[PDB]
Amino acid sequence: ALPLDTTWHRPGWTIGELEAAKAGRTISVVLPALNEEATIESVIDSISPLVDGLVDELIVLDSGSTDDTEIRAIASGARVVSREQALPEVPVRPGKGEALWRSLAATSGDIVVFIDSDLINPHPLFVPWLVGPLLTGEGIQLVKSFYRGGRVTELVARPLLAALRPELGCVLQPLSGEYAASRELLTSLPFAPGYGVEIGLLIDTFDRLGLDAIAQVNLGVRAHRNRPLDELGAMSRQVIATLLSRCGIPDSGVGLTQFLPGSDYTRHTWPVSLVDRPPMKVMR
């Protein structure tokens, strides 16, 4: 009844069904990580039992961590790839979108699944639930998750989509870090910088293929860190910059400034970026 293929309840496919449906296609899983020493092993362990079965390849894309992220991921049996190793001829820029774009050069699956490394005890069926529509559907190229407060999501991204791309009003979690897509789709799209990467991918997929190429699946419940409001302010600024650009509206490029009370106030300006990485295809 939503114009977007939506799975409201627990998917019924068995792991053995999903594997049969692969039909020669491979599956890579990428966990981007910046300083997630507390949660990274729980995330890797939720998925590693699938490896050499449903999942052909699993990597941690380490995004500059200075804690114990890398040593703990290695002790959980994961292949860890730095931003530099993924694509060593090209100097590294900051932010999540850079990490995800680089991960395309360090994987080879026909299907790529992204799962954030800050999840607290994620369900082991996340990955099977995300790949279902790509495997058993026709024409699905991108699958977004939703789940059971998403302040940026409910105050910024969903209302801006209603304003500027109302056809995507049916997407419940447009900014979700858990999703899967075909390599063919991902290497044909630019990747927005920083926290803009998810909203950019969704609007670009829709603008290029329409709703029929996109599905969303209920993952039930998900837990993670709640960042402080000021960090959310910078994140929201970058989401806004990427969304305005995809909708053809010129963004000033001026970073958000904040005034912090100590009354007595101090000022801080956060970076925003208007520069995308190009489709990974051009790097061939």
Ligand X SMILES: O=c1ccn([C@@H]2O[C@H](COP(=O)(O)OP(=O)(O)O)[C@@H](O)[C@H]2O)c(=O)[nH]1
Residues that bind Mn ion (CB under 5 A): 118, 224
Burial group, residue 156, by CB count within 10 angstroms (0-12, 13-18, 19+) = buried
| Structural contact between residues 40 and 69, judged by C-beta atoms closer than 8 angstroms | yes
- 96 marked ligand binding residue: yes
Mark residue 139 as left, alpha or beta (left: phi above 0; alpha: psi -120 to 50; beta: remaining).
Answer: left
241 labeled part of a ligand binding site: no
For residue 181, the surrounding DSSP H or E stretch is strand 179-182
Number of H helices, E strands in the chain: 11, 10
Q: Considering the rule CB under 8 A, would residue 141 count as an interface residue with its own copies?
A: no
Q: Which residues contact 200 (CB under 8 A, 6 or more apart)?
A: 97, 189, 190, 191, 192, 242, 243, 246, 276
Task: Find the shortest distance in angstroms from Cβ 223 to Mn ion.
Answer: 10
Over the window 30 to 49, marking each residue x when it contacts ligand X by CB under 6 A and - when it does not, the resulting string is --xxx-x-------------
196 binds ligand X per the rule CB under 6 A: no
25 among the known binding-site residues?
no
225-284: contacts with ligand X (CB under 6 A): 225, 227
From candidates 11, 174, 177, 193, binder to ligand X by CB under 6 A: 177
Selected binder of its own copies within 40, 113, 115, 172 (CB under 8 A): 172
Q: Are strands 257-261 and 179-182 parallel, antiparallel or unpaired?
A: unpaired
Rounded to the nearest 10 degrees, how much is the dihedral formed by the CA atoms of 71, 91, 86, 240? 90
Name the nearest CA neighbour of 63 among 38, 94, 23, 107. Answer: 94
Question: What is the sign of the dihedral through the CA atoms of 134, 171, 230 and 121?
Answer: negative
Stretch that binds ligand X, among 18-26, 115-123, 155-163, 245-253 (CB under 6 A): 115-123
Q: Which is nearer to ligand X, 92 or 209 (CB)?
A: 92
- Regarding beta strands 5-7 and 257-261, do their DSSP bridges make them parallel or antiparallel, or are they unpaired? unpaired
Pairing relationship of beta strands 142-146 and 179-182 according to DSSP bridges:
antiparallel
Among residues 63 and 273, whose Cβ is nearest to ligand X?
A: 63
Residue 137 touches which of ligand X, its own copies, Mn ion, none (Cβ within 5-8 Å per kind): none
198 binds ligand X (CB under 6 A): no
| Residue (259 or 284) nearer to its own copies, CB | 259
- Provide long-range contacts, Cβ within 8 A and 24+ apart, for 72-75: 72/37, 72/40, 72/41, 73/33, 73/40, 73/41, 73/44, 75/41
Q: Which stretch binds ligand X (CB under 6 A): 1-9, 27-35, 154-162, 263-271?
A: 27-35
Q: Which amino acid is at 4?
A: L
198 is in an annotated binding site: yes
Angle between helices 96-105 and 197-209 (to 10 degrees): 60
Shorter beta-carbon distance to ligand X: residue 208 or 225: 225
99 interacts with, out of Mn ion, its own copies, ligand X, none, CB within 5 to 8 A per kind: ligand X
For ligand X, the binding residues (CB under 6 A) are 32-34, 36, 63, 94-96, 99, 116-118, 177, 225, 227
The binding site for (2R)-3-phosphoglycerate consists of 150-153, 226
For its own copies, the binding residues (CB under 8 A) are 8-9, 148-149, 151-152, 154-156, 158-160, 162-164, 166, 169-170, 172, 218, 220, 229-230, 232-233, 236-237, 240-241, 244, 249, 251-252, 254-259, 261, 263-265, 272
